[PDB]
């Protein structure tokens, strides 16, 4: 057999990024390994291992579209860095793949119009499966600097489709969004 | 007393290199992004700059192009991963002294700076 | 976004790459604890080199071939593939289809030829810097055979438009050399 | 004098672990693949077995299933990368003592063996 030439070229492009990433992570390891900061190297390696853990959990929720969006986020152009975690045992959240993916794409887009570009913006998203009341909760804990927080006022007021925005605080440099789905 | 600007989105890398050029008694500065760099260049007017190519938002070629507008005699050593033949070539045409592919030897990097840097 | 078919494949692949790096870290971490520092740097270098060839292969405008090599060890086979690109990169796109098909063929033969109790390894090198040929391919296998006869055919009647300049096969090794114009 | 079998396709890992249990005075054996392992189990009859799950050709679950046919009382600690929840579960149901996710601490793995291994 033979896969489509379109896909074949995309996967090569992606692995290309993943590769570039790991070269940096090794840069970190090798660099500190030379400065003889051994204790620091193990620390980093553990961070890498953790990062990876969540990378696989996300890949095992039967939510490919979401997973793909998160896994490739930092490779596409954005004014903030995305980090994510899946808290709780894995679940077949497939019933929500399309919903979540679309939702995040929207939020990400708003942050892009909202965050400043001279600032170092970072956004952490956590997926909670272990919650007792909700089928699944999503936390977005951003921290950086805004240039137009107003971008959120709309969604802040009229909510969003069938998702429950339980919380949406926005301070001077941070933002905390909490979304429930059931 | 010689000024060196470290520009990389990756934090650990800025920390690493920063802790390197201090052992050489250099005045180290660091930016995590394009705009932050361009300011540090304007104000501090560094001597040598270590620029990452893959930075989210504004990539090295774009900022390298801008640093040039500010100070045409800006000494830039770009650093990136092997397989960025495009930017590596572009940065050369734009006036980048040389380049280092990650993961580079913490040693030869420190020399290339001492090299390209007067006294 | 993109097609749901592709989206799922890429996740599967990254999955493998991830599993690999976790092993590579296992090696670094492991030796880092055994305090074999000099060894760690050595391994890191090996990783860096493997990576270099991974990138060169991805820059010859030969996607289909690159994809086959890049994903080989993730598919089921009775030998491990290692590859290198010797020489500056070139636009070998005119050969993508040809090479890919060729290697698929060879790989298939080795699969039926190699023994399964043995640790089989195959190294493929792509030479672009050759003066006489547009591109040469070297396959240096080392392991153990159970049915070397699998090659007899190709060894006698060659293969379509490719020039098989050499095809030695001893007791545990095999050396194939193929030229392309 | 206690026999321990290391089974991993990844060479370096075999070397690593081997050079570990020797410092503990263990009689180490190693296989790169399923069949090689099954033989070393038949002949040498090891006490403990460190089995990698992802091996090309014949995976851990398959060989762990076969090692059982030979010696039902085979002590097997599987090791693999996180995110192999399937095989990790299967191996437990098939009779695997415990497991270790790579990259594990060269220390705790050495204990788990001294633990699960008598005198
Ligand atoms: Mg970078
Ligand atoms: Mg393995």
Swiss-Prot record, chains B, D:
Q: What class of enzyme is it?
A: transferase
- Keyword Endoplasmic reticulum carried by entry: no
Q: What are the required cofactors?
A: Mg(2+)
**Predominant location category:** cytoplasm
Q: How is it modified after translation?
A: Phosphorylated by KinA and KinB. Dephosphorylated by RapA and RapB.
GO molecular function (one): kinase activity
A Pfam family in this protein? Response_reg
Record's function text:
Key element in the phosphorelay regulating sporulation initiation. Phosphorylation of spo0B during sporulation initiation.
Identify this protein by name: Sporulation initiation phosphotransferase F
Curated annotation (Swiss-Prot), chain C:
Keywords, alphabetical: Cytoplasm, Kinase, Phosphoprotein, Sensory transduction, Sporulation, Transferase
Q: What does this protein do?
A: Key element in the phosphorelay regulating sporulation initiation. Acts on spo0A. Mediates reversible phosphoryl transfer from spo0F to spo0A.
| Gene encoding the protein | spo0B
Main subcellular location of this protein, as a coarse class: cytoplasm
Q: Which GO terms describe its biological process?
A: sporulation resulting in formation of a cellular spore
Localization annotation: Cytoplasm
Record PTM: Phosphorylated by spo0F.
| Superkingdom, natural source | Bacteria
Task: Output one GO MF annotation.
Answer: phosphorelay sensor kinase activity
* Gene Ontology CC: cytoplasm
List-wise, which residues carry Phosphohistidine? 19
Could you list the residue ranges that cross the membrane? none
User: What EC numbers are recorded for this enzyme?
Assistant: 2.7.-.-
Protein name per the record: Sporulation initiation phosphotransferase B
The record's InterPro entries line, in alphabetical order, gives: Sig_transdc_His_kin_SpoOB, Spo0B_C_sf, SPOB_a, SpoOB_C
Q: How is this protein organized at the quaternary level?
A: Homodimer. Dimerization is essential for activity as both monomers contribute to the formation of the active site.
């Amino acid at each position: 057999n033979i896969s489509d030439t379109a896909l074949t070229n995309e996967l090569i492009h992606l692995l290309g990024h993943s590769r570039h990433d790991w070269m940096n992570k090794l840069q970190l390891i090798k660099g500190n390994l030379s400065l003889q900061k051994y204790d620091r190297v193990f620390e980093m390696i553990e961070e890498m291992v953790i990062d990876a853990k969540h990378e696989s959990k996300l890949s095992n929720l039967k939510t490919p579209h979401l997973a793909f969006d998160f896994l490739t986020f930092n490779w596409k152009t954005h004014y903030m860095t995305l980090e994510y975690e899946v808290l709780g045992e894995i679940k077949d959240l497939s019933a929500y793949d399309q919903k979540l993916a679309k939702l995040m794409r929207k939020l990400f887009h708003l942050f892009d119009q909202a965050v400043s570009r001279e600032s170092e913006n970072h956004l952490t998203v956590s997926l909670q499966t272990d919650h007792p009341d909700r089928q699944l909760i999503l936390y977005l804990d951003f921290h950086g600097a805004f240039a137009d927080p107003s971008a959120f006022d709309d969604i802040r007021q009229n909510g969003y489709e069938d998702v429950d925005i339980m919380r949406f605080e926005i301070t001077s440099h941070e933002c905390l969004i909490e979304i429930g789905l059931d | 007393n010689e000024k060196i600007l470290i520009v990389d989105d990756q934090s650990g890398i800025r920390i690493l290199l920063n802790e390197v050029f201090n052992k050489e008694g250099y005045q180290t500065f660091q930016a995590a992004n394009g705009l932050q760099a361009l300011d540090i260049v304007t104000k501090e007017r560094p001597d040598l700059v270590l620029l990452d190519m893959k930075i989210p938002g504004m990539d090295g070629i774009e900022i390298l192009k801008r640093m040039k507008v500010i100070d045409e005699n800006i000494r830039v050593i770009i650093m990136t991963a092997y397989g960025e033949l495009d930017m590596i070539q572009e940065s050369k045409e734009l006036g980048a002294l040389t380049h280092f592919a990650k993961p580079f030897d913490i040693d030869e990097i420190r020399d290339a700076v001492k090299k390209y840097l007067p006294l």
